[PDB]
């Protein structure tokens, strides 16, 4: 019996490396559709965006 | 403080949202770039990821 | 041992941020890809979806 306003941090922390797993995965396709380009990075010219967990 | 801990969780919930309808969007729009492929999750060769709720 | 909270809300916001980063350049990455069709959600023929301010 914890939890007082960590329990809408406990779903956040979910949906987050949820959506991470679709953002990078999206990032996979991205890249792989973009591989003449060396990639969405390259291909955008910028700087590579990257996950930290 | 207290009062700011609920507004960072009311703010992140609403980044959180608005970014998964972004994400969600865009892969919505690899889904379509791969259609042909069945899917930028298949076209991935990949276990497919989800974001539901 | 004390305020994981707090500490955990500063983590969660700077997740969120390092994931609106790919996201948005994924973005990118997919307007770039439909310029012709005028961008990813036009592409889609979709409302365009935005992260946040
Ligand atoms: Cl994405």
């Given at each position: 019996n914890i939890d007082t306003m960590a329990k809408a941090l406990t779903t956040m922390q979910e949906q987050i490396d949820s959506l991470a797993?679709?953002?990078?995965?999206?990032?996979?396709?991205?890249?792989?559709?973009?591989?003449?380009?060396?990639?969405?990075?390259l291909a955008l010219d910028e700087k590579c965006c990257f996950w930290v967990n």
């Amino acid at each position: 019996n914890i939890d007082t306003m960590a329990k809408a941090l406990t779903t956040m922390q979910e949906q987050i490396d949820s959506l991470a797993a679709v953002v990078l995965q999206n990032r996979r396709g991205l890249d792989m559709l973009t591989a003449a380009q060396g990639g969405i990075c390259l291909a955008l010219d910028e700087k590579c965006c990257f996950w930290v967990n």
